[PDB]
Nucleic acid binder design. Structure first.
Ligand SMILES: [Mg+2]
Ligand SMILES: [Mg+2]
Ligand SMILES: [Mg+2]
Ligand SMILES: [Mg+2]
Ligand SMILES: [Mg+2]
Ligand SMILES: [Mg+2]
Ligand SMILES: [Mg+2]
Ligand SMILES: [Mg+2]
Ligand SMILES: [Mg+2]
Ligand SMILES: [Mg+2]
Ligand SMILES: [Zn+2]
Ligand SMILES: [Zn+2]
Lengths: 162, 38, 99, 42, 124, 40, 43, 71, 38, 177
RNA sequence: CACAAACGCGUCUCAGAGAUAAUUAAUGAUUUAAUCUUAACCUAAUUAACUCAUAAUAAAUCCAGCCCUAGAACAGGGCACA
């Protein structure tokens, strides 16, 4: 992990890069012959939005994401990680990875609405005024189609649109 | 009563709709994904 | 005419009442109604829903024993399913023939 | 510290009286759980 | 800054012309205060939860044509019977001890007032 | 319900079908002489 | 607000009522039964 | 288990006259109109107000005078 | 803006952006190329 | 087991107060068990002609949670009867104005449409936060478990669990986070 | 305008906060460039609705007769000054 430090000492600017010790991979994966990091740790079709401990591994401290060339993931599972990180961020998980702006925390707004399993964004969804009957129903999506491939212990499919 | 060939897609009988639904194509799904196979 | 038709519907209404009562007294023990019914049948105990609701109302310990038997049969069937073998046969999974 | 009887009531006093009735009934042997009468030919 | 005052109950006497120094003519309605007294005080948490309530009576009427509970509570209060009884929303820093009279010098010349009354009933 | 499980175990789909609950004669005399049979 | 023109189950425009999974499993069960029947009718 | 709640206190007793004090404990009485009585009963017993209103002559006459009893 | 069903770049400086749940052709050099999917 | 007729009947048809927490809970899964306990469909002595039915006190109504984007998509609509009196209020705005409205309307719609409906919402008590009257508090018997297991964030996880969860990947040292 | 009243052709009064759709921006990843974000975190500039501050009503059981600017009936306000 490399950090940059910018120093101002009397009309002289010094920009330096310093290496900080980084954590390493755990020594014994259960499936060593797998290429991809999730698919060698056997977390394919297992994790969800609730798994905070794995979604914290592939994120920036400011809530951003890391590219797939760095993370090494397969493309579909990288998209699944991206969707689950977005779902957790709108669900109110990862509270310490928001950026710090001390002028803005003091002017409080209306209290944060508790929500989870949000496929879309709060600001871009129109309210369904017209709705519909049973033979044409506008269904509110809950969860994402990227996560329909998870295992079902009940055996019933995950109802994504309700 | 409509003709045999129309332009309005000719909405089907319910038993034929059940026939279409049971005889939809399903792809072969391998046991382990070949991309993150070795 | 309504007397005859409601006489026909009386059996269905009373059966629905019995199923609601059995569902209530089984969910009071934390076991679902279809699991309770099929696991009571799998022990070759054939009590109809009328007398099962009757035990449920007036007979709390006996209905608790029946719910315990159904839960034990459900756990035994799940264990036999996850075992994937014919050699382990349980104490309540044995099948008794007529004599 | 052993339970011999328990009784219901609308009021605490009525419940206590009913618990005394249950205790007296279990002591004397008149219960709902008692032996029915023997109607037989000796 | 956001406080509210105690209002009055008056009697509409009539109407008069009035003139201004720029030459224009306005019309004034005459409101005579005859007997105005604060009656009782209802607290903030018992009335609305924002502002307290002050009870103000109107012009003085006869003892013999009022009700028994009304005469009993005015006998405890100490004043003769009033005609109309009204409720004013008043902030806690403007509370007045009950049984206190009020006068038209409560209003100063040059101010804006709100006027509430039963209008002229034209029937069906 | 559970007719399918009875079908794998060899019993009838209906519990009334040919079981020991069915071909036994449901009442008998107290001294032990057999009852007259059922028309069904 | 939204209407089905004419009668529901007759016309050019019908009710868009879909197929259900229960109907699907019923159809596969009936197909398996008749497949067993046409096996037993073979020889 | 928890012990029995013990509540017994007589605040109506007077040192001057116990015969007036016992009558003061029997001096509690109040009369109230129909509508306030119905909403008071509804708030007390957690039911709606529509049960407590009375019924007609035709409805009270068709009630069975001697209903069957079991047990 | 122009409200359209399918979107294309009329020059090389136009770009795609997903805003408010909809897709946008935004162009800086030629502002007449501003298009919005419906 | 041996009781008199009137106290036996009183014990059988006794009314019970239940407690229910609504913090981080879906209103539908809350209202399912709320509807069941308001019916008395958890009683084996249940009958539709009997007056069986239990009280339910729901707290933490302000801390309600919707799955998905239902906070902005789902609307609640009413008509005042007058022309031009049609009000479609988003569920976010309705919960901002009246906190108990969402759970009240969910239970009110889920309960069966007979004339016992008003009577059994008269036994329902809804409080937005944990501020219950003491007369209601002394009536309570048991608390029902929450239908949804609440997910915890990163800060509630202990460091034992943090080092117990294995690290999936090894980041390069030249990268900036 | 031949009733003490009604009337206009005559006179008086008429309002704050939040919220938004489209559209502009600030910070910043996937895609270490950028990029208003169906990426978050806090932001603003912003139509009409729509709600709420705020205003009205909001003191239980005297009511025979008489009057009334109150009224179809029932109701409502006065009847100690004088
Ligand atoms: Mg034809
Ligand atoms: Mg028959
Ligand atoms: Mg009039
Ligand atoms: Mg026959
Ligand atoms: Mg048609
Ligand atoms: Mg039609
Ligand atoms: Mg940048
Ligand atoms: Mg820019
Ligand atoms: Mg208001
Ligand atoms: Mg009067
Ligand atoms: Zn992979
Ligand atoms: Zn262009």
């Amino acid at each position: 992990f490399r950090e940059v430090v910018e120093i101002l000492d009397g009309k002289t600017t010094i920009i330096e890069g310093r290496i900080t010790e980084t954590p390493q991979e755990s020594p014994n994966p259960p499936n060593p012959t797998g290429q991809c990091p999730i698919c060698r740790w056997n977390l394919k079709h297992k994790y969800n939005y609730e798994d905070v401990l794995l979604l914290s591994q592939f994120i920036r401290p400011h809530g951003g994401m890391l590219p797939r060339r760095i993370t090494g993931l397969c493309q579909e599972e990288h998209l699944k990680i991206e969707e689950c990180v977005k779902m957790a961020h709108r669900a109110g998980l990862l509270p310490n990875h928001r950026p710090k702006l001390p002028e803005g925390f003091v002017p409080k707004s209306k209290p944060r609405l508790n929500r989870y399993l949000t496929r879309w964004s709060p600001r871009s969804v129109k309210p369904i005024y017209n709705k519909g009957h049973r033979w044409n129903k506008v269904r509110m999506p809950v969860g994402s189609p990227l996560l329909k491939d998870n295992v079902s212990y009940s055996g019933r499919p995950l109802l994504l649109y309700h | 009563g409509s003709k045999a060939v129309t332009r309005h897609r000719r909405v089907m009988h319910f038993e034929r709709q059940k026939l279409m639904a049971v005889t939809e194509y399903i792809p072969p799904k391998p046991t382990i994904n070949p991309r993150c196979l070795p | 005419v309504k007397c005859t038709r409601a006489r026909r519907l009386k059996k269905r209404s009373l059966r629905t009442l019995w199923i609601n009562r059995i569902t209530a007294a089984s969910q009071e023990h934390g076991l679902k109604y279809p699991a309770f019914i099929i696991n009571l049948i799998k022990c070759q105990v054939e009590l109809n829903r009328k007398v099962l609701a009757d035990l449920a109302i007036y007979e709390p310990k006996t209905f608790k024993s029946l719910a315990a038997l159904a839960k034990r049969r459900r756990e035994e069937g799940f264990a036999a399913a996850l075992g994937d073998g014919k050699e382990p046969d349980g104490i309540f999974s044995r099948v008794v023939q007529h004599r | 510290r052993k339970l011999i009887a328990e009784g219901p009531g609308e009021t605490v006093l009525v419940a206590e009286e009913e618990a005394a009735r249950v205790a007296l009934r279990k002591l004397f042997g008149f219960t709902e759980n008692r032996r029915p009468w023997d109607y037989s030919k000796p | 800054p956001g406080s509210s005052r105690v209002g009055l109950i008056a009697l509409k006497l009539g109407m008069m012309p009035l003139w201004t120094k720029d030459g224009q003519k306005h019309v004034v309605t005459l409101l005579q205060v005859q007997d105005c007294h604060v009656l009782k005080y209802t607290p903030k948490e018992n009335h609305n939860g924002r502002m307290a309530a002050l009870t103000v009576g109107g012009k003085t009427v006869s003892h013999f044509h009022k009700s028994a509970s009304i005469l009993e509570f005015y006998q405890e209060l100490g004043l003769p019977p009033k005609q109309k009884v009204k409720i004013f929303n008043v902030t806690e820093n403007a509370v007045i001890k009950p049984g206190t009279p009020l006068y038209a010098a409560h209003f100063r010349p040059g101010q804006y007032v709100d006027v509430t009354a039963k209008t002229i009933g034209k029937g069906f | 319900a559970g007719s399918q499980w009875r079908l794998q175990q060899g019993f009838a789909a209906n519990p009334s079908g040919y079981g020991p609950l069915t071909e036994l004669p449901d009442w008998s005399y107290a001294d032990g002489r057999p009852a007259p049979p059922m028309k069904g | 607000r939204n209407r089905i023109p004419g009668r529901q189950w007759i016309g050019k425009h019908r009710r868009p009522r879909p197929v259900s999974a229960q109907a699907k499993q019923n159809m596969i069960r009936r197909l398996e039964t008749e497949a067993e029947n046409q096996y037993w009718l073979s020889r | 288990t928890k012990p029995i709640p013990r509540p017994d206190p007589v605040h109506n007793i007077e040192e001057t006259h116990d015969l007036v004090l016992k009558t003061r404990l029997e001096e509690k009485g109040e009369h109230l109109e129909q509508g306030p009585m119905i909403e008071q009963l509804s708030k007390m017993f957690f039911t709606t107000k529509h049960r407590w209103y009375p019924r007609g002559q035709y409805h009270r006459r068709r009630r069975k005078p001697n209903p069957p009893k079991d047990r | 803006f122009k409200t359209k069903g399918v979107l294309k770049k009329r020059c090389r400086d136009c770009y795609l952006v997903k805003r408010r749940g909809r897709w946008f052709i935004y162009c800086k050099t030629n502002p007449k190329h501003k298009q919005r999917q419906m | 087991s041996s009781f008199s007729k009137a106290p036996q009947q009183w014990a059988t048809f006794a009314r019970v107060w239940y407690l229910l927490d609504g913090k981080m809970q879906p209103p539908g899964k809350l209202a399912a068990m709320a509807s069941v306990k308001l019916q008395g469909l958890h009683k084996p002595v249940y009958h539709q002609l009997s007056d069986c039915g239990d009280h339910v006190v729901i707290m933490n109504t302000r801390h309600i949670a919707f799955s998905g984007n239902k906070w902005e998509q789902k609307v609640y609509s009413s008509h005042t009867g007058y022309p031009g009196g049609f009000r479609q209020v988003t569920a976010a705005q309705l919960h901002q104005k009246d906190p108990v409205a969402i759970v009240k309307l969910a239970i009110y719609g889920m309960l069966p449409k007979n004339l016992h409906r008003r009577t059994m919402m008269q036994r329902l008590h809804l409080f937005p936060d944990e501020d219950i009257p003491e007369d209601i508090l002394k009536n309570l018997v048991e608390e029902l478990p929450q239908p949804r297991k609440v997910p915890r964030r990163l800060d509630e996880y202990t460091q034992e669990e943090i080092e117990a969860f294995p690290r999936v990947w090894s980041p390069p040292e030249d990268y900036r986070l």
